[PDB]
Amino acid sequence: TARALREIIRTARETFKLRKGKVGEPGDIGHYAALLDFGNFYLAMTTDGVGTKVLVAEAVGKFDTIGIDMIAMNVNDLLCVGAEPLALVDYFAVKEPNEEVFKQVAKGLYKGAEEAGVAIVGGETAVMPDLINGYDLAGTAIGIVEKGKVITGERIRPGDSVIGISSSGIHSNGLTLARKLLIPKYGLDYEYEGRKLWEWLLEPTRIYVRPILELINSVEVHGLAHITGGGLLNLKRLTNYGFELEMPPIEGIFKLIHENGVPLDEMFRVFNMGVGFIVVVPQEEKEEALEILSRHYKSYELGNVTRELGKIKVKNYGITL
Amino acid sequence: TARALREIIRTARETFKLRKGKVGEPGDIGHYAALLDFGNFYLAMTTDGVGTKVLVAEAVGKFDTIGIDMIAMNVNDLLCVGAEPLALVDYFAVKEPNEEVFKQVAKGLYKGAEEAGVAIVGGETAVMPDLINGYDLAGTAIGIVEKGKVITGERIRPGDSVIGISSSGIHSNGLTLARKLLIPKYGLDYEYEGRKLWEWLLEPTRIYVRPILELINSVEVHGLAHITGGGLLNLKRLTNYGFELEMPPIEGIFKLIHENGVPLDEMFRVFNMGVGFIVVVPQEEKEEALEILSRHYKSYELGNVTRELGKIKVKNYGITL
Numbered sequence A, B: 001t002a003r004a005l006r007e008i009i010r011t012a013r014e015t016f017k018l019r020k021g022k023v024g025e026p027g028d029i030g031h032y033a034a035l036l037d038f039g040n041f042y043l044a045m046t047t048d049g050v051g052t053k054v055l056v057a058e059a060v061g062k063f064d065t066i067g068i069d070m071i072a073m074n075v076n077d078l079l080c081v082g083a084e085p086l087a088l089v090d091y092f093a094v095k096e097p098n099e100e101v102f103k104q105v106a107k108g109l110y111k112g113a114e115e116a117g118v119a120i121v122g123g124e125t126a127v128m129p130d131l132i133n134g135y136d137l138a139g140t141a142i143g144i145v146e147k148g149k150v151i152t153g154e155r156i157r158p159g160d161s162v163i164g165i166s167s168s169g170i171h172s173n174g175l176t177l178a179r180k181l182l183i184p185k186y187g188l189d190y191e192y193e194g195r196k197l198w199e200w201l202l203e204p205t206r207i208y209v210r211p212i213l214e215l216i217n218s219v220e221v222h223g224l225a226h227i228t229g230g231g232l233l234n235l236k237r238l239t240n241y242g243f244e245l246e247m248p249p250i251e252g253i254f255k256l257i258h259e260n261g262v263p264l265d266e267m268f269r270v271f272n273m274g275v276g277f278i279v280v281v282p283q284e285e286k287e288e289a290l291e292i293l294s295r296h297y298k299s300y301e302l303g304n305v306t307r308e309l310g311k312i313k314v315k316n317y318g319i320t321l
């Protein structure tokens, strides 16, 4: 998988030379977004899809929130270089042009766009039943960040404060594991802690644009990480310094998954475990950062960056990543 | 499909207000690219996939050129608003992380990027065997066009000259019809004019960046159209005026399709029929435009813009669209 993707990554890096010294000259690949040089500012560009969450949407017949998921997966990544999201295009590859599905998808696209402050400006619709067994929804978003205001993680230093913003639930990663582990055994109508299994699996991804844009315009921020594939391992994309953290108690769908045989260390590498976005700020800014974020969503002081390198210590679970 | 898509298009237009008076304010949806206002210039944004051509690549086990198709589909669209292509991201949704397929895909991605002059700056790889029966490749491209230099088609006038640039072959539209009509009847190893059927169906899409950028910097240009889905109907996106055209002889794979019973009026709405890109220039510029374009590829004087509003007359075939 990494082996396969490395072939494309290598080729993409070779193509950087084609814009060397020209408008659009890129930074490196591998971060939450690509940065393209437009002189006084960078354009930030990112691409992501919903994933197999859309199979749960199709199973129950509820498509009016997967547009929120797709917008969230893109605009939340733009935030992680310090960019203001501006615009998005969607790529909708479908087995058939079902009018009711499209109507529902459009509802969630509007709600997500309004929350993120972005215009949906175009896209592609491909009807290909020979290739697509469902309704696959992906997109590409662009944002803007002033030169000198990019937030890469390079400024993260030992001692910095690490703050987590609560997720809304499972978001859009780990659904293949959750689907296969739980649906055949329990049924989509199984009730767990007051919600049906499909409600746990379909709850739309949280959009962090409003709290994060307020944060970065108020306090010094050293790193921003959207918690997606790889779970807490995404922190290692920002820095090689270590982390010492306390994570929230395991609740909801995450507890059901854990009780069905997924060990905790694997959980923290797959699921967001209740924290959808992590910010790293100088310890001098910690109280104000917590104050700002908490006005939008439940937020937690998780811990600190350490001089110890490359380790993520989840102290209250006794787990090291 | 149109009634399904209408729901998403209506929502998209509703989100335009979210950037009203701000950086990134968009133009209207429906053209070959979205235009976003960045002050002195517009960013142009387009999204497109290869389509079921990838099933022919998978059938024969050759993905070495599908990346060219995806880059061409996107950069050729950017040209139609007058934009210089800058950068692209790819969306690769796959049934399995096949290292051989990915290495092959990477080869054509590099070749296409170099011919178009774009950097591949990022993307998304989604391994989703329950959702994808093959290797679906799409992407999003961005380009730049100066204010006052956008080519929308609004300048097209009756009497303007219409020039076609030859296609390389089938390009990336009509493959569903061609696959289902020809492959079971003839076999992928069927030889027609010295090429196997799979060679006809897999021939990579032509990239028009170099001829068109030279053209728009040399002569007055009123309209530019990449001949994709809908075939000649794409001309109607540029203008409400009519067209009087003579199309080239029906050759190669298009002749084989025609000889298997598809009517010509449908074929001119599905296939490019030998013309992959059409330019509309004032009559006074016709000879210079032909000289510039013909340096790069075989090009044709097709005909003229007329006052027969909304009609495309292919006079040498007796067809009206």
Ligand SMILES: Nc1ncnc2c1ncn2[C@@H]1O[C@H](COP(=O)(O)OP(=O)(O)O)[C@@H](O)[C@H]1O
Binding pocket: A005, A008, A009, A012, A029, A030, A031, A032, A033, A047, A048, A077, A228, A229, B090, B091, B092, B121, B122, B123, B124, B125
């Ligand atoms: N098919 C691809 N082509 C080019 N770059 C890719 C592709 N898939 C992933 N990438 C790059 O790899 C990095 C990680 O991607 P991904 O695993 O989707 O995580 P994220 O969405 O958090 O960046 C990103 O910088 C992305 O642009």
Ligand SMILES: Nc1ncnc2c1ncn2[C@@H]1O[C@H](COP(=O)(O)OP(=O)(O)O)[C@@H](O)[C@H]1O
Binding pocket: A090, A091, A092, A121, A122, A123, A124, A125, B005, B008, B009, B012, B029, B030, B031, B032, B033, B047, B048, B077, B228, B229
């Ligand atoms: N899923 C979608 N979301 C938003 N806009 C779309 C979508 N599908 C198509 N469009 C818009 O409709 C127009 C026609 O698109 P398409 O049929 O792909 O033709 P082309 O690729 O030649 O533009 C384009 O402006 C495109 O941006």
